[PDB]
């Protein structure tokens, strides 16, 4: 805190730089945080009659926090550009924090109509656990971003948690956490607050695409020296008799050849179409879906496993859950049309992961003898074996930055399913409330809990830097690559820029891998 | 949700001191704590009165 009411407590820095090896960041948001469920916890439980996987139990606070998890927050779309287009691989270093500016307003509904004026000597309290004490929501890809485009003001969202349940009903570990147990700082309107975080080693987000399939690692000029069998019978006569021959693998065969690799595994997904025309008539939407079965209780996969999506000259097709899928500007809740909605495709990862919508492969059903023909059938789902290679995730724009790997035993692989980076300490989580003002006490003491409080909401300004870490590309490729361009030809209105009434909206996902490397 | 301690009267002669709803028995216990709103006078007349206030701005803290 310092010197207020009448000095402000901070500047806009807000700005971006680029050093030539790290990137900064900087934004600066304006808030408005009003005051939940009248300054009380409540648990909260879900209907009396509901399906078995719909249940829960869990409690709703009165504070309210702050979540920038989302790249949009930190990038401009230039500025995304000159990391896409020119960069190999990027990660998040560093960041800061603060909270500066804050002012305090009462509110009097006298009559018909409302008046605000200045609390001087009102606070509000702020704190960070930042030793990972709390349930955490974040990564959980919720709404309450920091806007996208500078100029909005957005309203801070309210905190909640969940617990362990039977039905609609507790369980006796079931925990619950009380947030005015934890120390916080209190702000009065000159004071400001500020904290600094320091990001876990994590590995490079892969930008590059592939130029080579795993299907084609080798020259076709020259002959493998190893055999493989060719031909199981022979034409001895007009009755043909078994001889086993073998073969050497060359550039007129290629499907035949030996490799030290296989593509990654698959959990498999039901495919559906664009054209409305193509898809069958009927509900299949929960039946068809793929999921997985915990405690009695199935729950959908969303992202699933990373897979290429629509296999090759068919764009048509994407599978059932298995991609991203984002809203354009003003988007209903529930039950919105195909063109409301921006689809993700991934095609890049061909050359590595398979295709969502198909199987693995096929393996060997029985053992053949002279009365009895082979058989196979076909895998649907595939674990990890040996020697297996795959990519992630797109993180795209608008997508989730990262997100906290559970405390466990054991995991494989940490990253996560929707996209960027796993961290076992992520950025702690900020809270903030409105500290409560009694009303006019009765002059007989009491002893009951006060029902009464001025109403009352408060604002300010909130500012967030990150400091992130490049990987240059270094390529011997001679013809040019592929980049992100936008659209030369005339229109109504530019992409990625307000309308005549002041709305901002983004047209398209932004992915960014582009720039080709060779596998 | 008893009571943490008690002051010993003070006495001649006591046996044992510990109380008996529970808890620690202190000859010098936490002091209390006392705290009042201060009175502000509400518009007093032209001419000298000298009885005493019987008006104040009402409110609390």
Same mark, same amino acid.
């Not at 009411?5 to 402000?8: A, K, L, R, Y």
């Not at 901070?10 to 900087?26: A, E, L, Q």
């Not at 000597?121 to 919720?142: C, I, K, M, R, W």
């Given at each position: 805190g310092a010197d207020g009411?009448?000095?402000?407590s901070?500047?806009?820095?807000?700005?971006?730089?680029?050093?030539?090896?790290?990137?900064?960041?900087?934004?600066?948001?304006?808030?408005?945080?009003?005051?939940?469920?009248?300054?009380?916890?409540?648990?909260?439980?879900?209907?009396?009659?509901? @399906?078995?996987?719909?249940?829960?139990?869990?409690?709703?606070?009165?504070?309210?926090?702050?979540?920038?998890?989302?790249?949009?927050?930190?990038?401009?779309?230039?500025?995304?550009?000159?990391?896409?287009?020119?960069?190999?691989?990027?990660?998040?270093?560093?960041?800061?924090?603060?909270?500066?500016?804050?002012?305090?307003?009462?509110?009097?509904?006298?009559?018909?109509?409302?008046?605000?004026?200045?609390?001087?000597?009102?606070?509000?309290?702020?704190?960070?656990?930042?030793?990972?004490?709390?349930?955490?929501? *974040?990564?959980?890809?919720?709404?309450?971003?920091?806007?996208?485009?500078?100029?909005?003001?957005?309203?801070?969202?309210?905190?909640?948690?969940?617990?362990?349940?039977?039905?609609?009903?507790?369980?006796?570990?079931?925990?619950?956490?009380? *947030?005015?147990?934890?120390?916080?700082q209190m702000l009065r309107?000159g004071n400001n607050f500020?904290? @600094?975080?320091?990001?876990?080693?994590?590995?490079?987000?892969?930008?590059?695409?592939?130029?080579?399939?795993?299907?084609? *690692?080798?020259?076709?000029?020259?002959?493998?020296? *190893?055999?493989?069998?060719?031909?199981?019978?022979?034409?001895?006569?007009?009755?043909?008799?078994?001889?086993?021959?073998?073969?050497?693998?060359?550039?007129?065969?290629?499907?035949?050849?030996?490799?030290?690799?296989?593509?990654?595994?698959?959990?498999?997904?039901?495919?559906?179409?664009?054209?409305?025309?193509?898809?069958?008539?009927?509900?299949?939407?929960?039946?068809?879906?793929?999921?997985?079965?915990?405690?009695?209780?199935?729950?959908?996969?969303?992202?699933?496993?990373?897979?290429?999506?629509?296999?090759?000259?068919?764009?048509?097709?994407?599978?059932?859950?298995?991609?991203?899928?984002?809203?354009?500007?003003?988007?209903?809740?529930?039950?919105?049309?195909?063109?409301?909605?921006?689809?993700?495709?991934?095609?890049?990862?061909?050359?590595?992961?398979?295709?969502?919508?198909?199987?693995?492969?096929?393996?060997?059903?029985?053992?053949?003898?002279?009365?009895?023909?082979?058989?196979?059938?076909?895998?649907?789902?595939?674990?990890?074996?040996?020697?297996?290679?795959?990519?992630?995730?797109?993180?795209?724009?608008?997508?989730?930055?990262?997100?906290?790997?559970?405390?466990?035993?054991?995991?494989?692989?940490?990253?996560?399913?929707?996209?960027?980076?796993?961290?076992?300490?992520?950025?702690?989580?900020?809270?903030?409330?409105?500290?409560?003002?009694?009303?006019?006490?009765?002059?007989?003491?009491?002893?009951?809990?006060?029902?009464?409080?001025?109403?009352?909401?408060?604002?300010?300004?909130?500012?967030?830097?990150?400091?992130?870490?490049?990987?240059?590309?270094?390529?011997?490729?001679?013809?040019?690559?592929?980049?992100?361009?936008?659209?030369?030809?005339?229109?109504?209105?530019?992409?990625?820029?307000?309308?005549?009434?002041?709305?901002?909206?983004?047209?398209?996902?932004?992915?960014?891998?582009?720039?080709?490397?060779?596998?």
């Open positions: 009411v009448g000095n402000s901070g500047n806009w820095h807000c700005d971006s730089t680029w050093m030539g090896d790290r990137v900064i960041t900087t934004s600066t948001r304006t808030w408005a945080l009003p005051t939940y469920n009248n300054h009380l916890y409540k648990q909260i439980s879900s209907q009396s009659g509901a @399906s078995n996987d719909n249940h829960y139990f869990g409690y709703s606070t009165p504070w309210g926090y702050f979540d920038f998890n989302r790249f949009h927050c930190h990038f401009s779309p230039r500025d995304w550009q000159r990391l896409i287009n020119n960069n190999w691989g990027f990660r998040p270093k560093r960041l800061n924090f603060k909270l500066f500016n804050i002012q305090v307003k009462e509110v009097t509904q006298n009559d018909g109509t409302t008046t605000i004026a200045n609390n001087l000597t009102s606070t509000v309290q702020v704190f960070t656990d930042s030793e990972y004490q709390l349930p955490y929501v *974040l990564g959980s890809a919720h709404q309450g971003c920091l806007p996208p485009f500078p100029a909005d003001v957005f309203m801070v969202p309210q905190y909640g948690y969940l617990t362990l349940n039977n039905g609609s009903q507790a369980v006796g570990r079931s925990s619950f956490y009380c *947030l005015e147990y934890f120390p916080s309107t500020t904290f @600094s975080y320091t990001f876990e080693d994590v590995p490079f987000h892969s930008s590059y695409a592939h130029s080579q399939s795993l299907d084609r *690692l080798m020259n076709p000029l020259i002959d493998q020296y *190893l055999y493989y069998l060719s031909r199981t019978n022979t034409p001895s006569g007009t009755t043909t008799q078994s001889r086993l021959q073998f073969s050497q693998a060359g550039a007129s065969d290629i499907r035949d050849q030996s490799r030290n690799w296989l593509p990654g595994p698959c959990y498999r997904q039901q495919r559906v179409s664009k054209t409305s025309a193509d898809n069958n008539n009927s509900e299949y939407s929960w039946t068809g879906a793929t999921k997985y079965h915990l405690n009695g209780r199935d729950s959908l996969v969303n992202p699933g496993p990373a897979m290429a999506s629509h296999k090759d000259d068919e764009e048509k097709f994407f599978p059932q859950s298995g991609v991203l899928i984002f809203g354009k500007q003003g988007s209903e809740k529930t039950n919105v049309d195909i063109e409301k909605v921006m689809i993700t495709d991934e095609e890049e990862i061909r050359t590595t992961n398979p295709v969502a919508t198909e199987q693995y492969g096929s393996v060997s059903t029985n053992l053949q003898r002279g009365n009895r023909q082979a058989a196979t059938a076909d895998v649907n789902t595939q674990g990890v074996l040996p020697g297996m290679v795959w990519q992630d995730r797109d993180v795209y724009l608008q997508g989730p930055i990262w997100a906290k790997i559970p405390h466990t035993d054991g995991h494989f692989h940490p990253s996560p399913l929707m996209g960027g980076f796993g961290l076992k300490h992520p950025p702690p989580q900020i809270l903030i409330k409105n500290t409560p003002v009694p009303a006019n006490p009765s002059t007989t003491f009491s002893a009951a809990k006060f029902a009464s409080f001025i109403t009352q909401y408060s604002t300010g300004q909130v500012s967030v830097e990150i400091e992130w870490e490049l990987q240059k590309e270094n390529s011997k490729r001679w013809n040019p690559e592929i980049q992100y361009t936008s659209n030369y030809n005339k229109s109504v209105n530019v992409d990625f820029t307000v309308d005549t009434n002041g709305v901002y909206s983004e047209p398209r996902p932004i992915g960014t891998r582009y720039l080709t490397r060779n596998l």
